[PDB]
Amino acid sequence: LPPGWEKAMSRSSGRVYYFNHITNASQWERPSGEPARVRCSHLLVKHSQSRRPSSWRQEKITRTKEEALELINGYIQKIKSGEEDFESLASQFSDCSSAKARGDLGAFSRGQMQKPFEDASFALRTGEMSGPVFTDSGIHIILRTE
Numbered sequence: 001l002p003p004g005w006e007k008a009m010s011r012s013s014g015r016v017y018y019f020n021h022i023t024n025a026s027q028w029e030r031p032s033g034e035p036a037r038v039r040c041s042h043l044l045v046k047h048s049q050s051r052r053p054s055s056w057r058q059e060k061i062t063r064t065k066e067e068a069l070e071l072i073n074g075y076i077q078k079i080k081s082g083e084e085d086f087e088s089l090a091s092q093f094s095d096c097s098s099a100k101a102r103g104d105l106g107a108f109s110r111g112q113m114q115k116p117f118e119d120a121s122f123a124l125r126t127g128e129m130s131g132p133v134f135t136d137s138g139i140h141i142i143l144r145t146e
């Protein structure tokens, strides 16, 4: 399987799935299928222990980390169900200023982002979306666009 991917058994179904411990992605289908540069967008939910608990959305961000994680989980569910798209949730709900660009961060190489974000970004394939990624900024959903 590609970097970070592992096989596991589901609790509810007994069906096998695949989990990525770098990106926190999980899916039923197998992935079997490194560039200098990637381009991603993201959706950031900040919390009380974020390095900077404020944003364009809220002067003082007070939600707990577990609360942020619950929000992130809700957004992932809507993106995966097709009920909302990534860009629209990012513009609306992301605590990053990149919310104004539908979450787009532009292209970047290794050495630039906080490491858990960088690693998750480089482990995604074009088109692929991460699970909840924790950094000192808060919790991220990352979509690799290029």
Ligand SMILES: CN(Cc1ccccc1)C(=O)c1[nH]c(-c2cccc(Cl)c2)nc1C(=O)O
Binding pocket: 044, 050, 051, 052, 054, 055, 095, 096, 097, 098, 105, 113, 114, 117, 135, 136, 137
């Ligand atoms: C930069 N920062 C404060 C901080 C300072 C030092 C270390 C970590 C976070 C943030 O909270 C922040 N971090 C990010 C961000 C954007 C892209 C990727 C990552 Cl890992 C963080 N956006 C913001 C923002 O406020 O818009």
